[PDB]
Design a protein around this ligand. Structure first.
Ligand SMILES: Cc1nc2c3cc(-c4ccc(NS(=O)(=O)c5ncc[nH]5)cc4C)c(Cl)cc3[nH]c(=O)n2n1
Ligand SMILES: [Ca+2]
Length: 109
């Protein structure tokens, strides 16, 4: 057994990811992709934010939480078996190599 997130075909999938803004409104860029975080930046990119807003998304992928307070959890709508796999949520902390890397396993049946 290990940590995983689950959905049936047709449901939405919910993959958690959080950080804490250093001060209110001080956002840091976030990278969501399919594939483990050792791949490129955050895998095969599906969604990105910068210090101001979401700047990139792919159909069916959403940040529906309060991402301006650090809830950068992902929603995938209407999943198929092909959406199964590891996803990377990368918190791109400016000022060093110290990014926060989260790998989330999505199991679809
Ligand atoms: C037609 C369609 N649109 C989206 C879409 C949109 C978004 C998105 C983009 C910016 C903001 N930021 S915001 O502060 O609420 C704001 N409001 C005005 C200016 N900025 C909030 C969200 C939820 C995302 Cl993340 C994911 C999306 N995914 C997707 O398949 N589609 N499809
Ligand atoms: Ca960094």
């Amino acid at each position: 057994s290990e940590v995983e997130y689950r959905a049936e075909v047709g449901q939405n999938a919910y993959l958690p990811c959080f950080y804490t803004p250093a001060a209110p409104g001080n956002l840091v860029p976030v990278c969501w992709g399919k594939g483990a975080c050792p791949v490129f930046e955050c895998g095969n990119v599906v969604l990105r934010t910068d210090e101001r807003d979401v700047n990139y998304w792919t159909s069916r992928y959403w940040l529906n939480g309060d991402f301006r307070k650090g809830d950068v959890s992902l929603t995938i709508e209407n999943v198929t078996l092909a959406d199964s796999g590891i996803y990377c949520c990368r918190i791109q902390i400016p000022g060093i190599m110290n990014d926060e890397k989260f790998n989330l396993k999505l199991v679809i049946k």
